Amino acid sequence: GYSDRVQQITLGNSTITTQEAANAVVCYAEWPEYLPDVDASDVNKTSKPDTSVCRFYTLDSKTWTTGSKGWCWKLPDALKDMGVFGQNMFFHSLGRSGYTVHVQCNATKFHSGCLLVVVIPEHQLASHEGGNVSVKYTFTHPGERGIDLSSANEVGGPVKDVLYNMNGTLLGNLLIFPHQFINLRTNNTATIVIPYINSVPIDSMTRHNNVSLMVIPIAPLTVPTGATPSLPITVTIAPMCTEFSGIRSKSIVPQ
């Protein structure tokens, strides 16, 4: 009586149940694991807070309306302030982590709409100015708020044009990245497990984000007659196999 459909994920002191899942994706078919010695470089023993950092943090909720263009969060940024995960983050020189991402959106059998939930490794954004204008730090570190693709261009911020993925590629091809759809008629959640993907064994958690999670409405939300025209979307994310190394004074970052 197991269905692909019902699932339970327990991680730390927190549990999620979905009764309307559509399997789960594990990026590149690899599950998060700690850093092996053969791959290690820094000689420091690392710190593995385990259950105090590897639990589920639910970010603040978004509201899908007929005019929504899509939202974008960066990792580990989105979690920069969650509990002890965040403290560890500002206090060590280097850290490394994988995540379980669970995006939630329920409706009824009269609604229609379909969101794309995708994880993009190394999502370098484009400046809407063109040329070689850079995208300032603050703009690519929105924190739990994430970036709202239907917000206005700002100065020093990225471009927010959806048919171009914020980088000069077409929305249609985002499907080459680990992703899952939430089609109100099928699905009510999306779950993706992200292994740590980098060109170095461990890195800085503040100067470099290693994935952007993106939720994009593709088939517009259509509510039943005289229904309220909107649904909330909630994102809950859990660091998994986290390791921190090179402890010290506590980083100070712009803004």
Partner: protein
């Protein structure tokens, strides 16, 4: 190898063509799941689509130019194109760039070919025979200031001398600082409020300085340098969506404003053929 097996009528409870794309999978459906097929063999291996093959041919990565002329009274050799440097890149001419950016991290050895041809746009009695010197200047080395500085001694820095009209060829191991090269990097060099975004120091493949060794003749000679780059021993990770809009800058993803629609509009209906 069979490309298609023989398959006949079906009346089952087992439907391989109904799936749920919401899952993120592309189910491996074949012609024989939905029509009646006959056996056929592949006769093919997919040899020429190997990434080593795809990135393994020489591409022009840079065209520069230097001239041989009397430096007498020149206050700025660099500025007179008496000599010229180039910080190696693979993202300035777009053909090879779009190919590499199909991947997120890439690792390979480089084979460089350098073709040099001379031009004599204004009245010369003859064509002189010039020798070019190409010096590989890694970050931290003294940089040439005049076209005949102590720098050119290049006692510790690899340099090649070849003749204009000829070609020079040598190969450099993968010089990246990390395990692979990130043509994308969603980071900064530090948490500064105004530091540059995206362009990083782990995509640096060195830098190269060119000059003519010859002193000047009576006429002036323009020498134009073309650098070709061939990846050998390629390793590529994490495929990405191909580049759709035009490029504007080395190292940023930025596209031009008021660009044009990249998807061709139908001449007719959705229903049109």
């Amino acid at each position: 190898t069979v490309a298609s097996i023989s398959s006949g009528p079906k009346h089952t409870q087992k439907v391989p063509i109904l799936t749920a794309n919401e899952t993120g999978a592309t189910m491996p459906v074949l012609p024989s799941d939905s029509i009646e097929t006959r056996t056929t063999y592949m006769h093919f291996n997919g040899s020429e689509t190997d990434v080593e093959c795809f990135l393994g041919r020489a591409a022009c990565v840079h065209v520069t130019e230097i001239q041989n002329k009397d430096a007498t009274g020149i206050d700025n050799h660099r500025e007179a194109k008496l000599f010229n440097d180039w910080k190696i890149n693979l993202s300035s001419l777009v053909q090879l760039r779009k190919k590499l950016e199909l991947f997120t991290y890439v690792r390979f050895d480089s084979e460089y070919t350098i073709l040099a041809t001379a031009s004599q746009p204004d009245s010369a009695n003859y064509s002189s025979n010039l020798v070019v010197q190409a010096m590989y200047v890694p970050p931290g080395a003294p940089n040439p200031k005049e076209w005949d500085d102590y720098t050119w001694q290049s006692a510790s820095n690899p340099s090649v001398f070849f003749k204009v009209g000829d070609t020079s060829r040598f190969s450099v191991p993968y010089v990246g600082l990390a395990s692979a090269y990130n043509y994308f990097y969603d980071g900064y060099s530090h948490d500064d409020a105004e530091t540059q975004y995206g362009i990083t120091v782990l995509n640096h493949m060195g830098s190269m300085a060119f000059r003519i060794v010859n002193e000047h003749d009576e006429h002036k000679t323009l020498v134009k340098i073309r650098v070709y780059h061939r990846a050998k021993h390629v390793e590529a990770w994490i495929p990405r969506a191909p580049r759709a809009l035009p490029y504007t800058s080395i190292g940023r993803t930025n596209y031009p404003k008021n660009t044009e629609p990249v998807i061709k509009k139908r001449k007719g209906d959705i229903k049109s053929y």
